[PDB]
Amino acid sequence: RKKISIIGAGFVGSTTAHWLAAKELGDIVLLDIVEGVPQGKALDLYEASPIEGFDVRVTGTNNYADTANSDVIVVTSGAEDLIKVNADITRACISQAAPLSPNAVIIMVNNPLDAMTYLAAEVSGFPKERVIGQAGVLDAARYRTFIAMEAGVSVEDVQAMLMGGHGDEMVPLPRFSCISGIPVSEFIAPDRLAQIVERTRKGGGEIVNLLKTGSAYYAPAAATAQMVEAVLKDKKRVMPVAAYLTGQYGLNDIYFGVPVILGAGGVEKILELPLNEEEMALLNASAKAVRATLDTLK
Amino acid sequence: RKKISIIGAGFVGSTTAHWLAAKELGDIVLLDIVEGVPQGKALDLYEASPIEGFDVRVTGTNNYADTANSDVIVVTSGAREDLIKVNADITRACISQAAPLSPNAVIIMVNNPLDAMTYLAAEVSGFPKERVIGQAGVLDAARYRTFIAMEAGVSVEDVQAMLMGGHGDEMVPLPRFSCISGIPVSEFIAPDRLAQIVERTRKGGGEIVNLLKTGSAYYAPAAATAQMVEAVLKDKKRVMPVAAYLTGQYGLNDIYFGVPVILGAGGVEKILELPLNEEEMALLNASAKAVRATLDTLKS
Amino acid sequence: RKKISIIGAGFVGSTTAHWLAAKELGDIVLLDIVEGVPQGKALDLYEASPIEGFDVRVTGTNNYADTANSDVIVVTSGAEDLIKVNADITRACISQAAPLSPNAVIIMVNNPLDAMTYLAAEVSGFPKERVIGQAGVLDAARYRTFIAMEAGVSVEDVQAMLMGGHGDEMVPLPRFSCISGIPVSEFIAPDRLAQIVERTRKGGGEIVNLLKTGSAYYAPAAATAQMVEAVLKDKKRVMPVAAYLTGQYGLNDIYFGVPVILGAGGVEKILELPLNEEEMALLNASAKAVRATLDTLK
Amino acid sequence: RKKISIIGAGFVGSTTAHWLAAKELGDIVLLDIVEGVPQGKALDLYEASPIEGFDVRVTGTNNYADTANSDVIVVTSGAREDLIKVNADITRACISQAAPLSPNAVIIMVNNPLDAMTYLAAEVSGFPKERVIGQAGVLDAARYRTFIAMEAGVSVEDVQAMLMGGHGDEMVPLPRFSCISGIPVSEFIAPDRLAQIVERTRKGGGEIVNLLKTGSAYYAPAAATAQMVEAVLKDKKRVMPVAAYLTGQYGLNDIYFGVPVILGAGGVEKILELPLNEEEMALLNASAKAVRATLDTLKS
Ligand SMILES: NC(=O)c1ccc[n+]([C@@H]2O[C@H](COP(=O)([O-])OP(=O)(O)OC[C@H]3O[C@@H](n4cnc5c(N)ncnc54)[C@H](O)[C@@H]3O)[C@@H](O)[C@H]2O)c1
Ligand SMILES: NC(=O)c1ccc[n+]([C@@H]2O[C@H](COP(=O)([O-])OP(=O)(O)OC[C@H]3O[C@@H](n4cnc5c(N)ncnc54)[C@H](O)[C@@H]3O)[C@@H](O)[C@H]2O)c1
Ligand SMILES: NC(=O)c1ccc[n+]([C@@H]2O[C@H](COP(=O)([O-])OP(=O)(O)OC[C@H]3O[C@@H](n4cnc5c(N)ncnc54)[C@H](O)[C@@H]3O)[C@@H](O)[C@H]2O)c1
Ligand SMILES: NC(=O)c1ccc[n+]([C@@H]2O[C@H](COP(=O)([O-])OP(=O)(O)OC[C@H]3O[C@@H](n4cnc5c(N)ncnc54)[C@H](O)[C@@H]3O)[C@@H](O)[C@H]2O)c1
Ligand SMILES: [Cl-]
Ligand SMILES: [Cl-]
Ligand code: NA
Ligand code: NA
């Protein structure tokens, strides 16, 4: 069976483990620095197996040795000061996990996402195609949900692409969204679409403001799990993910949210969209922001 | 539980029943005029339930009384003028007996000639046009999406497409209205290669017939039909191409034609009117002419 | 579409909502007394829909009016003093929800389970068959997981029945458990089986001891969701649930965990197992304990 | 991805391919000696992928070279001594060509006579006995579980059962080893009614043949076969009745017989030896005599 190790058994990590286990995608190892937590969450999930009908081992641990030979490593352990804290956490997680699973595809979820993925690439020394970050799938999912709700159509028929990072760094691309092949712009008028784009930008904060003490985890976990599935089943999904750029969109030496074909080899293709001047202005501004964070990290 | 009656226990009908059952979408009644066939296929499907894990009733019958009060009626009992005549007789017989027993059902036609038979079903049942539709576009778009996905090297889950008209020469391809995760298909496939894929889609049904030699496709056709049934039963509001009755859309009146619609609990909840360019209109008008001809023969 | 209202948007309630939504079982309404919480959890789940592919409305609210006309009402809002606190919470939830959904099946999850279900029956005034509690499905699930692990077989092939309540009130029935129709006792020897029975009794506490601050929710939610599904799809599942007894097992005027056939009408049959003297001694002791809790409630 | 080769693109084979594909269990290769049939069925199934949402390759072929390096080989190409002879020839041809190309595969036989053909497949392939099994018990138990569930008025998901031997007269019913959510089936069904259900199970295959008149069951048989394939590919360790090679179990030696096993990645990982009472042994011995006779004819 395939093996997936999830580093950080918090809300996102445990929820991700649940979806992966339910789909029988492989044995799951939940690791955390806090003793008892991962073991308890793993056992709780495991005990749901006779009810849900899945046969995969779900174990919790505090020892990185148990993550050896994983096919995929998901990192959901994150917390100017934010970069510092998360940078140390990421270096610690990757430096211990990477060596034990040399052929794994690493999927970063920790924030600041683009920068942390870049760091994981540096620390692991893995081929760039095998180190990616989850960000765009979640943001596109929120956009798709809003579009489906406004248009009054099935979420199964709404598809969309976007780039960059989260919040102000997000590069919306409404032009590159369709409903069963039909432009979204044919269903939703300009002003309403602009409102939906703005809601997408602030999507994470909207959940935080409602929860008061926590952040979103259901959609973030679903997005992460869909990426893991794409790798394990070599599905060649077309999705926006944080990938290492070598000239695409005029960008070099940087991890940025871009459309890719995701499969068993990780990023199997970075798609180059024919962005117009307005869209490129947005991308360039985002890249500048992402670049700043990266320079601070260095 | 919801109730679905499938008229015609052949390959498409029985395969459609299997998917609906596996998804526990509702109790299923398979009907056929041949004694023993539906009963045998229903029992076979039912005996698979402990393995597949579904709890829905699956029964075969030769009596229309068993289809009473169905939420959806699927017609897969079909067999140029001779073809139209034979199928017209089969369709009239099927609908004239089933419709009265399930007045609140949505009728989904599969019999060929599809558009014409859906029109006939509308007349015979007297049902509101929104509740009488035909499956054709979903299958055609499925073939197109399959070919595009394989050529572009991407998941079939990320390719979506719209098209209109009918099957074969009546098909109105609309590559401009197809995307891969929101990105235009034209950005992935070269024009010459795309034209080839469009042609393969037009001849998609025949391609299978020539391979089987003594049969026709049923897996994809059944999947398409089942997806439409699910759209209605679960009120999903799917955006898909289906044969619907037009009263002005695309310049067509009093005719069933494959068009983009929002499909849900009330059947067709909206007929979308896409802004077609001159070339696409030329294709559509030529197609409507062919559909009209079939419709006129039927009326004759 | 069917409508399911979940009262209490905590760990168990939100997790239950996730499974129900993923399976497209019906529109879900998450209600809670705390503002923002249910709305945030509902929106987070809803935004996962384009990824998971389900079309059902998931909304959060603080207003009981939004729960009107529900087909199923799940109560997961619970916290000698334990009976007091939970009793008031239960009376408040049911007295407000029951009147708005007169034809609903109520599934209680709050502890003390048997007593709270009895209370919900009193407050709602609903036919007894339509007011049940979730307890046995979770306990049997833990047992099945342990048996599957020890025997080295698929959890999909292990089935088991048990009765009573949780912990010391649980009435284990290893004799009534099989692996693909074969007695569990043929796979697992007496001493090891006794160990597994004891682990099942302490199953909830085992998770609490590992989590340190929280309790189990994945398996509890799965158990609850399986019961909701049984009702919505009229599956006639045979499972142990807290039901009102009118003479079965020699018990009257009490809610107790017993084997039932669960469907759209709620409890459609209470099965009467041919328990031997040893098993009946266990049941009688449990009933005495459950009876004591009930008397205190009164 | 895992790779599954299905030899014989008839009803059972094609239906089995559909389930495996829908569950994305691995790439599927459908092989048949008739040109065009497998290619047509494979393309039809493949074109359903955008609708059902699966990303696995489904191809049809007439060349065994395309089945190379398969994880599992399913044989559904079969057609008293005449029956044995014809099928023996088909099985030998199928196995002698496929086995060498997929040395690490688990072979799952479906051809009738099941036990005898599985024995033949073992000989021809030379594979370790644990990796050569036959599907028969899962289907028989499925029919039994279906009848029990309907009679008891409970979900098919909660009825489990074990049985041994072969099909029809060779079937060894074991009601004592069947439960409903852990509760003995005997507590739900009266003795006389249970005996009737056991009889219906024995004649289960024939019941379908008589209804169809010109065909045989394939939905339940395919479901049973697919569940076994899944058990191997996902190393689930399912406890199920399958035709396995005995070397002493139940007093039987050098013979394939339906017995309880734990099925996983290595094929048969354990043959369970149930403590049968005198009456059950009488049934088993009579069955083994019938299976032995078929085996001896084959060896002749
Ligand atoms: N849409 C997105 O891009 C998105 C959405 C949500 C959360 N996130 C990010 O994902 C991460 C996890 O979010 P969460 O809400 O699940 O957090 P959380 O606080 O619930 O869980 C993080 C877990 O990491 C563990 N941890 C810390 N240091 C560790 C180390 N060195 N090794 C192993 N485990 C360690 C903690 O003990 C904790 O259980 C955060 O960095 C957050 O910002 C991103
Ligand atoms: N993509 C498409 O548009 C598409 C795809 C497949 C099939 N079709 C059409 O669907 C129909 C069925 O195709 P099939 O391959 O399943 O055929 P089939 O011959 O396998 O089955 C048709 C079944 O209808 C039954 N039947 C005939 N007259 C009947 C009546 N009056 N009442 C009840 N049952 C009756 C037959 O006995 C037979 O079992 C055909 O008309 C075919 O052209 C269209
Ligand atoms: N296996 C079992 O039988 C089992 C397992 C776990 C939990 N439980 C029980 O289930 C209940 C929920 O457990 P949890 O861990 O999810 O708890 P929790 O504390 O996470 O969530 C309970 C939620 O109820 C809400 N609440 C309180 N009073 C309310 C009222 N009057 N109306 C509406 N909402 C109200 C809270 O604000 C909170 O969000 C508890 O009573 C617990 O003991 C039983
Ligand atoms: N429950 C059971 O035990 C059970 C259930 C169903 C079928 N079966 C058996 O399974 C076999 C298949 O049944 P079916 O209904 O699918 O039959 P079928 O006649 O529909 O299909 C068999 C296919 O095998 C092909 N074939 C023949 N010889 C071949 C060879 N040498 N190589 C490759 N392909 C070859 C044919 O051309 C045909 O397409 C039969 O032997 C039948 O008795 C057993
Ligand atoms: Cl960043
Ligand atoms: Cl109690
Ligand atoms: Na969850
Ligand atoms: Na099928």
Only one residue has tokens 């009147």, namely: C99
Q: Which two tokens stand for residue C128?
A: 């007894």
Question: Do C1-135 and C136-296 fold alike per CATH?
Answer: no
Q: CATH number of the domain at D137-297, out of 3.90.110.10, 1.10.10.10, 3.60.150.10, 2.40.30.10? A: 3.90.110.10
Contact D165, D287 (CB under 8 A): yes
* Distances from the Cα of D169 to the Cα of A201, B40, B218, D207, angstroms: 69, 21, 36, 14
Torsion on CA atoms C57, C61, C64, C66, rounded to nearest 10: -30
The ligand 4 site (C-beta within 6 Å) comprises D 7-13, 31-34, 37, 76-79, 90, 93-94, 110-112, 114, 136, 139, 167, 205, 216-218, 221
Fold of D1-136: Rossmann fold (3.40.50)
Transcribe C61-130 into DSSP letters.
Answer: ES-GGGGTT-SEEEE-----HHHHHHHHHHHHHHHHHGGG-TTPEEEE--SSHHHHHHHHHHHH---GGG
Q: What is the largest CA-CA distance in chain C?
A: 55
Non-local (6+) Cβ contacts of B267 within 8 A are B106, B128, B130, B131, B132, B133, B232
Q: Three-class SS of residue D194?
A: helix
In chain D, domain spans = 1-136, 137-297
From CA C75, how far away is CA C119, in angstroms rounded?
A: 12
User: To probe the interface with C, which of B55, B157, B181, B235 has the most C CB atoms within 10 Å?
Assistant: B55
- Is domain C1-135 in CATH 3.40.50.720, yes or no? yes
For ligand 3, say whether the CB of C217 is within 6 Å of any of its atoms.
yes
Q: Which two tokens stand for residue D64?
A: 């065994």
Other CB atoms closer than 10 Å to residue B182's CB: what's the count?
Answer: 29
- Supply the residue whose CA is at minimum distance from atom 28 of ligand 2: B77
CATH class of C136-296: alpha beta
Q: Which ligand is nearest to the CA of A44?
A: 3
From CA A201, how far away is CA A197, in angstroms rounded?
A: 6
- The chain D residue lying nearest A54, using CA atoms, is D236
C110 known ligand binder:
yes
Distance C265 CA to ligand 5 centre (A): 54
C9 known ligand binder:
yes
Q: Three-class SS of residue D209?
A: helix
B58 φψ region: left (φ > 0), alpha (ψ -120 to 50), beta (else): beta
| Residue A188: half-sphere exposure toward Cβ, Cα within 13 Å | 24
Torsional sign, CA B232, B235, B241, B242: positive
Q: Three-class SS of residue B92?
A: helix
- A226: chain D residues, CB-CB within 8 Å: none
Q: What is the resolution of this structure in A?
A: 1.8
Q: Indicate the residue type of D261.
A: V
Q: Which two tokens stand for residue B243?
A: 């044969």
* A152 bridge partner residues: none
Q: Is A108 exposed, middle or buried (0-12, 13-18, 19+ CB in 10 A)?
A: buried
**Residue B13 alpha carbon, nearest atom of ligand 2:** 16
User: To probe the interface with D, which of C238, C239, C268, C273 has the most D CB atoms within 10 Å?
Assistant: C238
A244 phi, psi to nearest 5 deg: -80, 125
Non-local (6+) Cβ contacts of D205 within 8 A are D167, D168, D216, D217
Secondary structure letter of residue A152 according to DSSP: T
Q: Which two tokens stand for residue D253?
A: 């030696």
Query: Residue A118's closest CA among A100, A106, A101?
Result: A106
From CA A33, how far away is CA A76, in angstroms rounded?
A: 12
Contact A145, A284 (CB under 8 A): no
Contact A26, A1 (CB under 8 A): yes
Other CB atoms closer than 10 Å to residue A65's CB: what's the count?
Answer: 8
Distance C161 CA to ligand 6 centre (A): 19
- The chain C residue lying nearest A17, using CA atoms, is C218
* Distances from the Cα of A81 to the Cα of A111, A209, A296, B79, angstroms: 12, 22, 10, 73
State the smallest CA–CA distance between residue D62 and chain B in angstroms: 13
Entry field: residues in chain A? 298
Query: Residue B23's closest CA among B281, B234, B295, B296?
Result: B234
Non-local (6+) Cβ contacts of C288 within 8 A are none
From CA C54, how far away is CA C47, in angstroms rounded?
A: 10
Q: In this structure, are strands C252-263 and C237-246 parallel, antiparallel, or unpaired?
A: antiparallel
Q: Which two tokens stand for residue A272?
A: 């180059």
From CA D169, how far away is CA B26, in angstroms rounded?
A: 36
From CA C212, how far away is CA C44, in angstroms rounded?
A: 26
Contact C95, C83 (CB under 8 A): no
Contact B48, B15 (CB under 8 A): no
User: To probe the interface with C, which of D140, D155, D234, D235 has the most C CB atoms within 10 Å?
Assistant: D155
From CA B248, how far away is CA B257, in angstroms rounded?
A: 12
**Residue A134 alpha carbon, nearest atom of ligand 1:** 3
Q: Is A190 exposed, middle or buried (0-12, 13-18, 19+ CB in 10 A)?
A: exposed
From CA D145, how far away is CA D29, in angstroms rounded?
A: 31
Q: Which two tokens stand for residue D264?
A: 């996983």
Non-local (6+) Cβ contacts of D137 within 8 A are D163, D164, D165, D240, D241, D242, D243, D258, D259
The question of whether D167 is a catalytic residue gets the answer: yes
From CA D105, how far away is CA D128, in angstroms rounded?
A: 10
Q: Which ligand is nearest to the CA of C289?
A: 6
Contact C55 B234 (CB under 8 A): yes
Entry field: residues in chain C? 298
For ligand 2, say whether the CB of B77 is within 6 Å of any of its atoms.
yes
Per the residue annotation, which of C3, C18, C144, C166 is the catalytic one?
C166
- The chain A residue lying nearest D231, using CA atoms, is A55
* Distances from the Cα of C72 to the Cα of B14, C77, C102, C252, C267, angstroms: 34, 15, 10, 26, 13
* B245 bridge partner residues: B256
C11 known ligand binder:
yes
